[PDB]
């Protein structure tokens, strides 16, 4: 009983794991002047940000 | 007489000076995750490249 409240809920993990993954990707290309297809993550990094709270 | 051939003509200077100026700008924003308006230079850095020969 009360399984979701047995461990913890600091973050959704999956989402938080994806955000830190896409943001760290921009630096790579942006550093190698490959931000063309890389900077696009800016749209997913910003949208996933607000969802951080709506998620957990 | 022969003024354009008195000094030299390694490069157009103005163009070559602008290209190195726009390309060095991308690294700045791209490094501070500001490639949004910065990555746009990619269009001027690539177009000015081919013009490098058509110029001098």
Tokens of A55: 């998620």
Going along chain A from its start, the domains and CATH numbers come out as 1-56 (4.10.860.10)
Q: Say how far apart CA B34 and CA B1 lie, in whole Å.
A: 50
**B30 chain-A contacts, CB cut-off 8 A:** 30-31, 33, 35, 39
Query: How far apart, in whole angstroms, are the C-alpha atoms of residue A17 and residue A11?
Result: 9
Q: How many CB atoms lie within 10 A of CB B29?
A: 19
Helices marked H in chain A: 14-31, 35-38, 41-55
8-state DSSP, B56: -
Within 10 angstroms of residue A38's Cβ, the number of other Cβ atoms is 21
Contacts B39 to A, Cβ<8 Å: 30, 35-36, 39
Query: What is the rounded distance in angstroms from the CA atom of residue A4 to the CA atom of residue B13?
Result: 66
The experimental technique behind this entry is NMR
- Residue B35's nearest CA partner among A51, A45, A15 is A45
Is the CA virtual torsion A15, A36, A39, B30 positive or negative? positive
């Amino acid at each position: 009983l009360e399984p979701d409240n047995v461990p913890m809920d600091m973050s959704p993990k999956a989402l938080q794991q994806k955000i830190h993954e896409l943001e760290g990707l921009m630096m790579q290309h942006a550093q190698n002047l490959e931000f063309e297809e890389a900077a696009q993550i800016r749209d997913q990094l910003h949208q996933l940000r607000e969802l951080f709270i709506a998620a957990s």
